[PDB]
A paper describes a structure:
[name] bnAbs show outstanding breadth, neutralizing up to >98% primary isolates, but have uncommon features. Notably, long heavy complementarity-determining region (CDR) H3 loops with aromatic residues at the tip facilitate bnAb binding to the hydrophobic [name] and nearby membrane. DNA sequencing revealed [name] was from subclass IgG1, whereas most [name] bnAbs are IgG3s. Using X-ray crystallography and cryo-EM, we determined the orientation, angle of approach, and composition of the [name]-Env interaction.
We reverted the V-region of [name] to the most homologous germline alleles, i.e., VH1-69*06, VK3-20*01, while leaving the CDR3s unchanged, thus creating [name] gVmDmJ; in a second antibody [name] gVgDgJ, putative reversions were also made to DH3-10*01 and JH3*01. The MPER671-683-bound (2.47 Å) and -unbound (2.6 Å) structures of inferred germline [name] gVmDmJ notably differ in the conformation of their CDRs L1, L3, and H3. When superimposed, residues in CDRL3 in the unbound structure are shifted up to 6.8 Å from those in the bound complex. This shift of CDRL3 in the bound structure may arise from [name] binding, which cause a rearrangement in the aromatic interaction between Y32 (CDRL1) and Y91 (CDRL3). We note that Y32 has affinity matured in [name] to alanine, which does not affect Y91’s orientation; thus, the CDRL3 and L1 conformations are similar in both unbound and bound [name], and resemble the bound form of the inferred germline [name] Fab. In both complex structures, MPER671-683 is helical with W672-D674 in a capping 310 helix, and germline-encoded Y91 (LC) and F102, W47 (HC) form an aromatic patch with peptide F673 and W672. Surprisingly, [name] gVmDmJ and gVgDmJ still bound the [name], but with a 6- to 12-fold increase in EC50; DJ-reverted [name] gVgDgJ also bound, albeit with a 369-fold increase in EC50. Hence, [name] gVgDgJ binds to Env when detergent-extracted from membrane, but not on the cell surface, whereas [name] gVmDmJ binds both solubilized and cell surface Env. Strikingly, [name] gVmDmJ neutralized 12% of isolates at 50 μg/ml and 28% of viruses at 200 μg/ml in a dose-dependent manner. Thus, [name] gVmDmJ binds weakly to and neutralizes some primary isolates prior to receptor engagement.
Author numbering:
A (entry chain H): 1 to 52, 52A, 53 to 82, 82A, 82B, 82C, 83 to 100, 100A, ...
B (entry chain G): 671 to 685
C (entry chain L): 1 to 27, 27A, 28 to 213
Write the structure that this text describes.
Amino acid sequence: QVQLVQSGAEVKKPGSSVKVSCKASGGTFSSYAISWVRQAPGQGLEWMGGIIPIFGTANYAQKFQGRVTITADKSTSTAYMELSSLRSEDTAVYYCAREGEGWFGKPLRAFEFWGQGTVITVSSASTKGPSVFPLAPSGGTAALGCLVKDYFPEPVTVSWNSGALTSGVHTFPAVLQSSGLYSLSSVVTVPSSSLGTQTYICNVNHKPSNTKVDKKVEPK
Amino acid sequence: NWFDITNWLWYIKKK
Amino acid sequence: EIVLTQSPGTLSLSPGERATLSCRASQSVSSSYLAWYQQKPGQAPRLLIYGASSRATGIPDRFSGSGSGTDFTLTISRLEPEDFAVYYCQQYGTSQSTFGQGTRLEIKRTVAAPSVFIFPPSDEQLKSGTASVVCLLNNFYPREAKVQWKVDNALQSGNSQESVTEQDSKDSTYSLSSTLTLSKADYEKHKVYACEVTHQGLSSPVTKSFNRGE
């Protein structure tokens, strides 16, 4: 039925402004409110504001008044969320939600329909590719991995053997260092008997910096 | 309440 | 305007057990305008209950909402492996909508000991001027663990960062990776490098170590 597609991720600098779109598809668009909810890494949900497209007047959260502008374009059936004077605390995933549709046209008030979410990273670091280092391995189970250190921004995708190896894979969440860069690790446990005969290649794909790395990890 | 407005719009539309 | 408080913070239950989450409001919520949402890692929040008790479309009847005014309750009769996630409440009785801080519902299993591994810094990174040691705590339960780094039996501080994986969808265990970052000179100056893990299901903390240069 109703579907909400948001725009891609964005990396902004402190003090600047960012604008996120939300194209709706299906059902009525004018007489149904669209809300925006953000969520910082590790934190919880947070209501920012809403708009009923048939009215130009919106409804903002008192905490965000002065920085949030929510406008709707009925011509394209698209909602817009704009945030000015960005700060590092604004680094969050911005979801665009729509109220629920019940029996007939009678609308609910809870947020039944949601978008995929836009990753807004408010930071001051520059785009940088990661340094991939091999975590060489030294009942019969051997653990090996790759250290994906010093990259910006999020995320980086990791696979093993071009994605053919999934069992025992543990790709850890990234940790934001004090230099503004990110860092994560990915490990996989394999039979120790298959070390001297199977090749293990960790694949790192950092799309923002256009960096693909195939690091071969072999035991010591 | 603001979240009631979207329901009032449904009334005069269909009633 | 209205501050929602969710209880408890973390809840450990087994599949088949009964779950009860409370959401208290600082003031009365008009017309029971309370909603319960579920959110899984990496995904968007999914609506469960609206109007304090009315179930959403496609939601199994094992989810039930109750309460009104200043106290609301979400009840999950029989738990299933796909019911373990984060739960939020949201009031919309006033124009200023607000959410709760969240109640995470994880899986309870038997105590699992971590498998402890240690990885020295690679030569490629050693020729870059920085040495990163890694300590892996593979597959354990509960989530609470403690990692300590020892460089020549001297404890470290303010120079290591840890990361914990999500809840495993098969064995319900956790894993932890601790990265210790040192300069190349500080690394080549010392000899022994160890990581000591303290956790439940362990008689005493286990130390995994290696000696630099062999």
